[model samples]
Target: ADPLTPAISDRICKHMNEDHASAIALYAQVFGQQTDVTMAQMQAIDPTGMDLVVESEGGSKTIRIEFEQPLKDSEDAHQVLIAMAKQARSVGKNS
Candidate 1:
């Protein structure tokens, strides 16, 4: 249930780009350094289905999502991710 729309792949790319930039900034803030987590780590950690990659130099970053087919719009995706993150955090706590 959204008004604005871009092409499916374009929107996904836009989101990934924005999120990857933010993630790098956050990592620097928290850890005082950058990262180089590979694609395999991304898939292993992000079970929300929102696949993306981050590569950064200083404040600039690039994101890549590995996919042959672009995803369709789904209103539940955010909610689903929140739920998944909560579960992952809980599992981490227990382990």
Candidate 2:
């Protein structure tokens, strides 16, 4: 219902980019359909979606991966992001 604040957005971006880079790249590969993404960095995270800078061999570009359901708040954001990452990692055995 509410947009993420600037401080919250930057905090998530920094943590993901520094420690969860793999999940960031996985998000691009699975959701953004970036097959050969060498890297992906979190640009911003919102209640509606996440923005990323994805890099492939050719170059890098910004992509927005929207949530299937818009988040309610940062707590919802945490759960949704974790669930999405779980789905992204599950590869072929989708539930």
Candidate 3:
């Protein structure tokens, strides 16, 4: 499925980069295993993974954080995102 076409990726990137940066930051910590990240932004997303731009005190780079399975469609995009958020949040509570 072409669920994550360029335009769709652009819209999502703009949406998250503008307001949901911390969401990416949290995912980067969990999935990207980025402990020293200064910040993170959603660069784009596709069927298999989400692209993240991670910044650290030293430098910045992009990382591909893959989903458990290839997405079914655009609908699955937010589904997986939210599910991961809750999963990540629940794990976060292990503090």
Candidate 4:
């Protein structure tokens, strides 16, 4: 299936980078197993996943994280993100 529209994806990326940078970093750190990250930027978001750029002492790398299920729209994106954050936290705690 097609992902989010480019306009919606751009808005989602902007909002995440501007307002939830720390959350993005947490996602990269826990899900991507990226330690020593100094910055995390949301590069793109779609129905099934997101792309993130993580910067650390070693340099930068892009990581992709997928939603637990398909997202139908912006509202679905919100719910999936929250669920992913909770999942990330669980993984972090266990690690």
Candidate 3 lDDT by residue in tens digits, 22-59 = 77788887778877778999988888899899999879
**Model 4: residues with Cα > 4 Å off, grouped in runs:** 1-3
Alpha carbon lDDT at 55, candidate 1: 39
Candidate 1 TM-score, C-alpha based:
0.34
Tell me the whole-model lDDT of each prediction, alpha carbons only: 0.36, 0.85, 0.81, 0.85
**RMSD (Å) per prediction:** 8.8, 2.9, 2.0, 2.7
- Which one wins on TM-score? 2
TM-score computed on alpha carbons, candidate 2: 0.88
Model 1 lDDT tens row, 4-28:
2444435544553456444423322
TM-score of 4: 0.86
Q: Tens digit of lDDT per residue, candidate 2, span 24-89?
A: 888898888787889999999987899999999989999999988877677887887798789889
State which candidate, 2 or 3, has the greater lDDT: 2
Clashing pairs in 4: none
| lDDT score for candidate 1 against the true structure | 0.36
Q: Estimate each model's TM-score.
A: 0.34, 0.88, 0.86, 0.86
Instruction: Residues 22-77, candidate 4: write the lDDT tens digits.
Output: 78888998877898889999998887788999999989899998776778888888
Ranking by lDDT, best first? 2, 4, 3, 1
